[PDB]
Amino acid sequence: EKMFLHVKGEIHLGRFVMRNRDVVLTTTFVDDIKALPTTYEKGEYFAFLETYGTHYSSSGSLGGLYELIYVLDKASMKRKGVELKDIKRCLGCVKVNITSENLIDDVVSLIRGGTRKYAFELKEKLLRGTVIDVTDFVNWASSINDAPVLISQKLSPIYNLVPVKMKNAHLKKQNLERAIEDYINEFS
Amino acid sequence: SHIDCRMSPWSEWSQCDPCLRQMFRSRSIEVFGQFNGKRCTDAVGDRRQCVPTEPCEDAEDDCGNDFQCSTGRCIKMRLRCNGDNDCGDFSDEDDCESEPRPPCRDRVVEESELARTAGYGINILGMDPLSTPFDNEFYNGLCNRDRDGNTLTYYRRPWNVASLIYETKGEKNFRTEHYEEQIEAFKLSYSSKKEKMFLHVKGEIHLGRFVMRNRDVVLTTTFVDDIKALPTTYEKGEYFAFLETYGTHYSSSGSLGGLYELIYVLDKASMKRKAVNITSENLIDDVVSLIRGGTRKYAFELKEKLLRGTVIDVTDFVNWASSINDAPVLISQKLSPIYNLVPVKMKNAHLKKQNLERAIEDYINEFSVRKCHTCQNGGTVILMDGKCLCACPFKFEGIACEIS
Amino acid sequence: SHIDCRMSPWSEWSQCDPCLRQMFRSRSIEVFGQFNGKRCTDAVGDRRQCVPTEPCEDAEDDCGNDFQCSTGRCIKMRLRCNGDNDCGDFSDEDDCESEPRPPCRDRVVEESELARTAGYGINILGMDPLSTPFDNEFYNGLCNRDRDGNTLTYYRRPWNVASLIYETKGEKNFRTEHYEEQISKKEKMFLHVKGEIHLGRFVMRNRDVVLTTTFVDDIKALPTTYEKGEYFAFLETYGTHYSSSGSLGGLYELIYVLDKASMAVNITSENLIDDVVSLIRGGTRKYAFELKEKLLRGTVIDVTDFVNWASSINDAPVLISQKLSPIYNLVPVKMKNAHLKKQNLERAIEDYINEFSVRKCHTCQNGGTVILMDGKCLCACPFKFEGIACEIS
Amino acid sequence: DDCGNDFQCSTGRCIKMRLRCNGDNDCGDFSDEDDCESEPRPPCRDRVVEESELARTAGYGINILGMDPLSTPFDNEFYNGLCNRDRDGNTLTYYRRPWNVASLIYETKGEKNFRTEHY
Ligand SMILES: *[C@@H]1O[C@H](CO)[C@@H](O)[C@H](O)[C@H]1NC(C)=O
Ligand SMILES: *[C@@H]1O[C@H](CO)[C@@H](O)[C@H](O)[C@H]1NC(C)=O
Ligand SMILES: *[C@@H]1O[C@H](CO)[C@@H](O)[C@H](O)[C@@H]1O
Ligand SMILES: [Ca+2]
């Protein structure tokens, strides 16, 4: 045997893209660069690289998302009274009472953004082994306006933000590259 | 096995740019990564400050008989008193209090929200749209008193959108396609069946269409200034950085609107023969929906309904069709290279155009999927941020479709 | 298989145009890209600035005794001092102080939007009703009162429109055709429906045209020397043609098609196919985007939905069909080198006819045929052939 | 450091002299805006706008399988004294775009997939 069922959804609110020159940083970020030594002071450069970030998203996507993999092997329920089209129909039915039954168990939840009330209601219905109603998804979708999450991102390393006016600018950027290169070996 | 990042370093260093007080470098990316081996995040080009080795030239670039705007734009002088915003700074209009009048005398009129976002920048990396290189706030003193759109009420068309129109066209398509096949024999008893489904649906709700004026174009102060910063010297990764963050192209053709689409693909097989007892079953199922444009309350309400056996309520479509008034998406367009907007009447502009085209060719060649390794079995190569890979909804598995 | 973009070299530089202060050459597309190879974009005309090699001529181009408006467009004093603002930049307050009232002495009258959009430009690429070359807000100082269209209310008709006759037509054309055969059994269906409503027809005046300040001044800006890029830029921003007349209205069209067959030893087979489509244009959104959906389903329609949809065409028409006139007929003589502009607009349109030819793209596989799109020659095919070149099934 | 004819900021920045009076918090805690009350000239000509909460957090600092607890290295409270604006189609409200964010496009797009393969 091999078997899986997936349900996946996107809610997309907007695209952001950002500058690569004439950038204005927070003063607290360029202060953290002005405090770096001229030397490859690896412990301090790893301190900075976790005091703001290793990379940044030169662009991303504001929204919300779900992935709800049914690890459930169909035959775990399909031996009892439900056809393949009927279990589908119940997930999105009279042949058993699947919403009352202990039969649906192994559905995973990943849910991103929106107000906790609605995210919880979707999660609670899924772990009980029950489908969400279309009412529930539109209520969730309305709430992503208050609480977005990044669905996907396109990435660049943080040393690109270091201003060209910085005393020892190229040396610091080259030492941040030397530090970024070590992370890949620091973690197995 | 999967493939991590490969590159070679700068191998060059510019002299100091006199007016810009800076120097540049750019490096050869070989392979960003394949099959989820680790990304090349490191920079395609970088720059360093220099105290310049010679004087800068005369910095002014005055267009002459045109007014040199406080933004650095250029325009016909008289408009600077008219209540049109010519300048990219309203207070140049505030300055000339002596001849204030708007471009229309008695008209009561709206801003076209379709015209404001007309001429999006685009990046070929995903056909991402980007905010307009174009100004779209200036009227060129033209009254241009249109009344298109479903409310039949006046709007003014800003100087860059030569055409903008609000055409009310729709189309919808349906296909549902089904097969069943059976083979059975005896000598040993053998039986088998196959079942197939295909669906396509789409529907288009057009709102409008546009074209951008290819001469005397009026640009965002930022775009016309963000040409000034350019190296003049074909520093590959720097012209790549402008192409990355104002886009490879700017466009003008429109289908603005809402759109929906669906597919089902289902394909199913079962086989048995019969002491000896042998059997197999194979089945692939896939169903997908898309919605774009309109407001959340109705467009997100529709998106899931489309997949189901559920017959959709016609007034839900009518509420969506109304909401596309507020929230269009660009369904189709005509691309034009971004360099056509670096204007005449600015220093070294042709050399800046030459470098922008060569950097578009570099954009085309370094993202080229021809560099990546062959996908296995029935698949074909896919590109994503920092990696090549492939995937196959067709009885194949793994990040290169290696196995079945 | 997939094919990439290809172009000529860049032609040798023009000399410096004296008044335009620029110099260019061009680059022909050979192949736009085909079958999802790397699609073309890159420019066919591009230009460099020059400090000119000789003097520009005297810049004024006034039509003699005519009034020199702030547009620099040729007009006569009756058009300005009667308050009508014909000359293109609302200047009339400068011209007269005593009784400058509009030509409709007391009986001042509304305009029409369906009239204003008359003489849309059109382009063989995309066939778009580009916004008017004509300045339909010029009225030639005429009061010119229609009372036509279904709003049962008066309107002033624009100078460049000979008439906007609301010559109404509503036509439904319908066909069905079906067959059955048995020995095995076969069943076949075709359905076609179209409905057309013509609200009216506009005709553009064939002499004495008033063009938009932008159209006339954007031909003043031409090279004078046969350079593709600036001529193509005028084409691509104003049309290859103007609609010298056309029909405003709405349209719907539908199809359904079905084709069905059915046919120790145990052998059998079944075959089926389905194809359904709907189109709507014109009318206000609520009714149109009801009806285009509504008619794709079998639903026996409320006649009041047809009445509401097609009533709304009075407020929101689409151009059903029109008479194309080659665009250069709109360079008004009594302008400097006016005919040399005509000549090279025609030569640039002939150059348009050269590179956008699909015929030179490579053959699609199996039962297919080639189409051209923005940077791709491509095909789509019968008999379940597949991929953008139809090489497989 | 030394902004020349332009203005040197409290926690170390340069603000162009035209910015300082406008109302935009050019230099942190409104420390740009000490006294210019004779010429407080706005970026927008009395247009209604509210500050984009969806973009003020954009440009998050990122780690390999992680993201920052403190909002950004970029300063999304900076606007170059421009008024350039995007809008929410859902409430019809206009927002200024932070000058870090080269583009905001607000798009309503919903995509949903169900899938199984079985053997
Ligand atoms: C095959 O499986 C069926 C299941 O009912 C069983 O009855 C039959 O005896 C099996 N045949 C064999 C043993 O090959
Ligand atoms: C028909 O199907 C049966 C199923 O067992 C098979 O045994 C037989 O060979 C096929 N031919 C006949 C019976 O027509
Ligand atoms: C001359 O034309 C060539 C094409 O052969 C270009 O590559 C070059 O940039 C220049 O325009
Ligand atoms: Ca002005």
DSSP chain D: ---TTSEEPTTS-EE-TTTTTSSS-SSTTTTT-SS-TT----SSSS------TTTTT-S-EEETTEE-SS--SB-TT--TT---EEEETTTTEEEEPPTT-SEEEEEEEEEEEEEEEE-
Contact of A47 with chain B, judged by CB distance below 8 Å, is answered with no
Distance between Cα B186 and ligand 1 center (Å): 17
The closest alpha carbon to C87, from C104, C70, C106, belongs to C70
Report yes or no: D103 and B131 within 8 Å, Cβ to Cβ: yes
The H or E element that residue A37 is part of is none
The helix/strand/coil state of A66 is strand
Residue of A8, A22, A25, A26 to mutate, interface with D, max D Cβ within 10 Å: A26
Q: How far, in Å, are B62, C256, C278 from residue B173 at the CA level?
A: 56, 10, 6
Which residue's structure tokens are 């471009």?
A: B103
Q: How far is CA B317 from CA B114, B311, D13, D107, in A?
A: 22, 12, 52, 18
CB distance C179 to ligand 3 below 6 Å: no
Q: Are C82 and C141 in contact (CB under 8 A)?
A: yes
Tokens of C86: 């014909």
Which backbone phi and psi does C50 adopt, to 5 degrees? -145, 140
The owner of tokens 């000789």 is C54
**Could you tell me if the CB of C289 is within 6 A of ligand 3?**
no
Q: Which of B232, B354, B334 is nearest to C10 (CA)?
A: B354
Q: What is the atom index within ligand 1 of the atom nearest the CA of B276? A: 14
Tokens, residue B324: 């596309």
Please report which ligand is nearest the Cα atom of B274: 1
Collapsed DSSP state (helix, strand, coil) of residue A76: helix
Closest CA to B258 of B304, B296, B310, B287: B296
Spatial CA neighbour of B215 closest among C121, C246, D16, C234: C234
d(CA B89, CA B67): 13
Q: Which two tokens stand for residue C170?
A: 């509503």
Question: Rounded to the nearest 5 degrees, what angle is found at the Cα of B117, between the Cα atoms of B76 and B168?
Answer: 115
Our CA-based measurement puts residue B142 at a distance from the nearest CA of chain C, in whole angstroms, of: 7
Selection from C206, C218, C216, C245 nearest residue C87 by Cα: C216
Q: Please tell me the distance between residue B185's alpha carbon and the centre of ligand 2 in angstroms.
A: 5
Separation between Cα atoms, residue D37 and residue C67, nearest integer Å: 49
Instruction: Find out whether B190 and B273 touch, Cβ atoms under 8 Å.
Output: yes
Q: Are the C-beta atoms of C287 and C308 separated by less than 8 Å?
A: yes
CA of A83 to the centre of ligand 1 (A): 22
- Resolution, angstroms, 1 dp: 3.5
- Please state, in angstroms and rounded to a whole number, the distance separating the CA atoms of residues C51 and D64: 56
Q: Please indicate whether chains D and C are in contact, defined as at least 3 beta carbon pairs under 8 Å.
A: no
What is the C-alpha to C-alpha distance for residues A133 and A88, in angstroms, rounded to an integer?
14
Give first-to-last CA distance, chain D, whole Å. 67
- C-beta neighbour count of D51 within 10 angstroms: 12
Please indicate if any CB of chain A lies within 8 Å of the CB of D92.
no
Q: Is there a contact between C290 and B317 if contact means CB atoms under 8 Å apart?
A: yes
Q: Hey, how many other C-beta atoms are within 10 angstroms of the C-beta on B12?
A: 11
Q: Which amino acid is at B48?
A: R
Q: Cα(C377)–Cα(C361) distance, rounded to whole angstroms?
A: 7
Nearest alpha-carbon partner for C90 in C215, C213, C273: C213
Residue of A nearest to B122 (CA): A17
Per CB-CB distance under 8 Å, the chain D contacts of B307 are 112, 114
Q: Residue B337 is encoded by which pair of tokens?
A: 């290279």
Chain A residue closest in CA terms to B329: A14
Contact list, C264 vs chain B (CB under 8 Å) = 186
Scanning the structure block, which residue is given the tokens 């992935």? A67
Other C-beta atoms lying within 10 Å of the C-beta of residue C34: 25
Half-sphere exposure of C182 (CA within 13 A, CB side): 4
**Could you tell me how many helices (H) and strands (E) chain A has, helices first?**
7, 4
Q: B-D interface: how many C-beta pairs under 8 angstroms?
A: 106
Cα separation, B128 vs B151, whole angstroms: 31
Instruction: State whether A20 and B244 contact (CB < 8 Å).
Output: yes
Rounded Cα distance between C40 and C5, Å, is 5
Contact D42, D18 (CB under 8 A): no
Q: How far is B74 from chain D (nearest CA, A)?
A: 18
Helix C228-238 crosses helix C338-355 at what angle (to 10 degrees)? Answer: 80
Q: How far is CA B252 from CA A15, B330, C126, in A?
A: 20, 11, 12
Residue of D109, D117, D119 to mutate, interface with A, max A Cβ within 10 Å: D109
SS (H, E, C) chain C: CCEEEEECCCCCCCCCCCCCCEEEEECCEEEEEECCCCCCCCCCEEEEECCCCCCCCCCCCCCCCCEECCCCCEECHHHHHCCCCCCCCCCHHHCCCCCCCCCCCCCCCCCCHHHHCCCCEECCCCCCCECCCECCCCCCCCCCEECCCCCCCCEECCCCEEEEECCCEEEEEEEEEEEEEECCEEEEEEEEEEEEEEEEEEEECCCCCCECHHHHHHHHCCCCCCCHHHHHHHHHHHCCEEEEEEEEEEEEEEEEEEEEEECCCCCCCEEEEEEEEEEEECCCHHHHHHHHHHCCCCCCCCHHHHHHHHHHHHCCCEEEEEEEEEHHHHCCCCCCCHHHHHHHHHHHHHHHHHHCCHHHCCCCCCCCCEEEECCEEEECCCCCCECCCCCEC
Name beta bridge partners: C47: C24
Nearest to A57 among D59, D90, D115 (CB): D59
Instruction: Determine which residue's CA is closest to atom 6 belonging to ligand 2.
Output: B185
H or E segment at A49? Answer: helix A42-51
Measured distance between the N- and C-terminal CA atoms of chain C, rounded to whole angstroms: 15
**Nearest CA-CA partner of A7 in B291, B289, B268, B384:** B289
